[PDB]
A paper describes a structure:
HIV capsid has a pivotal role in regulating viral DNA synthesis and shielding viral DNA from cytosolic sensors. The beta hairpin structure (BHP) above the channel can assume ‘open’ (His12 forms a salt bridge with Asp51) or ‘closed positions’ (with a bridging water molecule between His12 and Asp51).
We solved the crystal structures of HIV-1(O) hexamers to 3 Å and found that unlike HIV-1(M), it exclusively adopted an ‘open’ channel conformation. Comparison of HIV-1(M) and HIV-1(O) hexamers explains the importance of position 50, which is conserved and located in the BHP hinge region (compare Fig. 4b–e). However, in HIV-1(O), Y50 has been retained from the ancestral SIVgor, preventing water coordination and BHP closure. However, comparison of the HIV-1(O) hexamer hinge region with that of the published HIV-2 CA N-terminal domain structure (PDB ID 2 × 82)47 and a modelled HIV-2 hexamer illustrates the similarity between these non-pandemic capsids, and suggests an ‘open’ BHP position for HIV-2.
Author numbering:
A (entry chain B): 1 to 85, 94 to 176, 179 to 220
B (entry chain C): 1 to 86, 93 to 176, 189 to 220
C (entry chain D), E (entry chain E): 1 to 85, 93 to 120, 124 to 176, 189 to 220
D (entry chain A): 1 to 85, 96 to 120, 124 to 220
F (entry chain F): 1 to 85, 93 to 176, 184 to 220
Write the structure that this text describes.
Amino acid sequence: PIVTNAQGQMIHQCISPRTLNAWVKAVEEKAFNPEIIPMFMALSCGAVPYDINTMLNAIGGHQGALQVLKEVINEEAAEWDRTHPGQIREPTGSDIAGTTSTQQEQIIWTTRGANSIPVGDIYRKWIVLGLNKMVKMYSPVSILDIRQGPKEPFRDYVDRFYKTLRAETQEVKNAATETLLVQNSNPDCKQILKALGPGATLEEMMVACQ
Amino acid sequence: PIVTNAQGQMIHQCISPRTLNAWVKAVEEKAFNPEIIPMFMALSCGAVPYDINTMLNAIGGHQGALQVLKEVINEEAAEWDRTHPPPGQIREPTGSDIAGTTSTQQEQIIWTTRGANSIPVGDIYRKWIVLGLNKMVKMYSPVSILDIRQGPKEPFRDYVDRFYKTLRAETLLVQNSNPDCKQILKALGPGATLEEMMVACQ
Amino acid sequence: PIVTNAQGQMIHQCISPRTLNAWVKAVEEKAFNPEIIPMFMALSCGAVPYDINTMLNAIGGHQGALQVLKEVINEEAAEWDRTHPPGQIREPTGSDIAGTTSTQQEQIIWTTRSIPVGDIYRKWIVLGLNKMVKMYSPVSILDIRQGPKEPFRDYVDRFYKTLRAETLLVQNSNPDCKQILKALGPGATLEEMMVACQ
Amino acid sequence: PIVTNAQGQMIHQCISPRTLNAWVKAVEEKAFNPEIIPMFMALSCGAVPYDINTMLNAIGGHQGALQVLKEVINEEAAEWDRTHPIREPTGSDIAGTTSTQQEQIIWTTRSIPVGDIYRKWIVLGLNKMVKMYSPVSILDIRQGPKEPFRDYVDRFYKTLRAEQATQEVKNAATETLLVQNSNPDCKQILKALGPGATLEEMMVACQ
Amino acid sequence: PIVTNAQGQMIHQCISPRTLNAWVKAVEEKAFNPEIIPMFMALSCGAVPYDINTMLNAIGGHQGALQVLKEVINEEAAEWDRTHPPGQIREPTGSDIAGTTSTQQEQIIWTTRSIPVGDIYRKWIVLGLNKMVKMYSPVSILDIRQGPKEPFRDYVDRFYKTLRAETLLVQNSNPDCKQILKALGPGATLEEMMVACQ
Amino acid sequence: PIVTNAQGQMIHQCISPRTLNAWVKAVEEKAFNPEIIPMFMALSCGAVPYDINTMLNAIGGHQGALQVLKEVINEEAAEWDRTHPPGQIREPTGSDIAGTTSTQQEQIIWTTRGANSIPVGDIYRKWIVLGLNKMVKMYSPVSILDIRQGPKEPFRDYVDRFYKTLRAENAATETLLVQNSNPDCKQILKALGPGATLEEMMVACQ
């Protein structure tokens, strides 16, 4: 990340061994479940591209997934260059990816006074795009084929419903609640849920199926 | 959270990996047992809404539960906007600004640390989530206080813990005690403390 | 706890997640053995009643034990109210010291004005915890007798562990040691006893 | 690393016990898998050559590996002295063998980044070790008859990372083998997607 | 320990959960082997008697050992009162230094006026711990004899391990080394002895 | 170590529970393998002799090794006194640098004085590393001559045992490495000609 010294200058601070190991453990445990996105965003908070590359390269397995991320980064870096053909140069696509830029150069870009480019946040946005492709990828089933098992508790069916929905806005969710959640529930709950009338909250539904 | 830099300015500090894992492990282990409420309040203490959403979004399972929280948060945000109707300075925070959905890290700090009309969006948003979390504690409570009956050979100590654990999730203690203790408990006369009861059944 | 900001004002500081887990693990690991009393006192050091309630409420199990504590707290709060009947803070009631009817800020004003509401509430809880330590004590000190081939070292530790939860040491010692201990007369130090039985 | 004391002077900072043990555990756990390179670069971040030698010398096993590193360091030290005839730092000064902590700070804070240069040399030796402990060749990575393409892709790029470790400009032509060594059911699907399809498009079409 | 607030005054700082567990784990793991002495001095470094009693009281087992320590503390406290008989603070008694009749604040003023009551009380406890280290020493130095096929290096470690709890080294060595050791003449260092017995 | 208080004065700061346990665990796990030397220098960095003695005395086993160290410390302290015969501190003797006859405060004044600053902390660390090296060679069981590749041992593992033993005692002679390899590799290794790097050798025996 970036920090200010006693002198008031913007200097680089190395990513901590704790944060790096926390990221390694997260990818090993949480695979590419939807919660890997906020885990990445939290651990990469305030990081410059130099720090972020350390995180990605430190992952041991999942090398096919990391290859998908690196492909996505090249696409976004190319799109950047397309719209962006003793002072500091303007950052290229590879400069934002930290592959052709140094720690110090990345700090100058984020903290300069005129035309401040947050290269850290942009590169984080590129990686979230690749992670979203992987999160969508390890969830095969679509929200339409999420039907409550004959002897599945309604609590657990609701979690599979919204987990799958998460892998895919706030409003497109509300279209699935009143048309797919009630439709795909098992016959024991569909009778009870339709008996609560329209406009019932999700809380009122989960209690009525307990 | 918020911290002061070397110059004395109020700047954002990212939530620590320690705190984040402590909250993630807590939800994994404690489901929505009653003790999840004080854990959130302790771990999110001093957090801005940006930090708090990271905690909620880091949860892996319980996505149906989190949707109940999002309903409660929107309801409370509506109450805010209703009682807080809408160049150069920051805007006045809306309901969604306190929920951190339409406001940034910097804006949240400006609201909390400004000398004029300091609105603590972090504490307000924590209050909204505790309301949603309280709804979940009742929901994952399996047993009713009535089906907690002492086993024929169950120690009274362990029976008392299952009794008050169930009571926590949402004259009766003596009725549901096993036949051996019921004779002993009624023999202690009225007004006996829980200490006296646990000793007389050991 | 309480801290001073850059302006020099008394403000509330959140109990640390480390300290909270230390208390949670202590209750999980040390049950209600006698050493839970110093553990509570150390981990709740400098805490206002708001902080202490976070500690008690964070415990998952042991709810029967916590119910005994709240009975003790109500009794002590009543004793407070009995002896303590515009623009300034009210005088704290029993429940204000228990943090149930008082806020974080009110608790700081009381302590830093000069009524230490934090330490008083700790005294009430230690009183309740003492009742639980005696309660989970399985064996009575009278039924602590030295095994036939038990070393005097281990018997003494097992003896005083029981004594901690709530002339007899020499009586319940094995036959080999009682002769040696009675031959030293009464008033010999425990060092002299432990050396003479090794 | 280098830090400023209360007076504002550049003084040596002792490497922390946390960082040192993290590196010790990393070598114990990660052997010479490819991810040992980022571990070293992250844990040696901001380090002077004095600090870096403490990390290398703290390793318990793998003494044959360190001898490969020490050969590589001497090879790079010779190249340095050849192109570069306090004093001005020699090749051995960057390795921290003939220079002191204070001298290394003077060089870095003028400006020759002796810490970063010596890290660059050690990454060269560690890359040689990553390639060496790589068991399987990329040619013998073929998709199983009932192996899911997802799992085949991960074994493929695990192996591919291990042998392109010692390469400066990585050879992107080798990935074509992924389609060649894939099982007959997916090769039909992959040849049906034509060349230039992204790895995402391949992994979706084989699930 | 003692710290200075923003105003520059000496105020009490509570012992950290990290330090307290380090002390609890140490006594659990290292029993009363000789290395418990330096462990205590490091973990109780800078502590006032209030802090030190927290450490001792947090120990769960070893209650017979702690009972010997508390005996020694009273003896030293009596010796203090023996040699140390309005508006300002009283002069500290033996029990005041032991933290049994003195508060956190009183202890700090004494040290920060002087009298290092923390260091004195640590010194008294080291006396009791030394009595315990000698007491849990099982074997005497004479029954530490080099095995017939024991390497001299390993014999030396058992020799000085036992010797630490409370010219002989050469006597108790096996016949194979005694020939070599006596043949090196007197005044040879222990280093020289270990090379000649390898 | 030494730190500055709010007043700006040089005062002693107690060694951290983290560092001390790290040192205790290090000696328990790493015995007297060569890697014990870096652990000591890193964990004792910035320490005064008072702190360092706390580290040594906290070690539970290896009391014969510590007895060798105390001889070496006394030997080096004598060398100091031989070459180093009203209001401020005395000048430090050999035993003062070993922390046996000097206090915490005395050690700090010596290290932090502007004029004639004697770094008693670093000097005593040098004496102990000298003794610890003697123990590293001593727990080295085998001599470099009896390190021969097993009949079915992979050359990789033989190289590690070779240089581990060599580290315990700058000769820089690899003539034994090729000589003591098993007959299958010696044929291949001698066939690579002189001047081949260790990388090329380890690759050619895989």
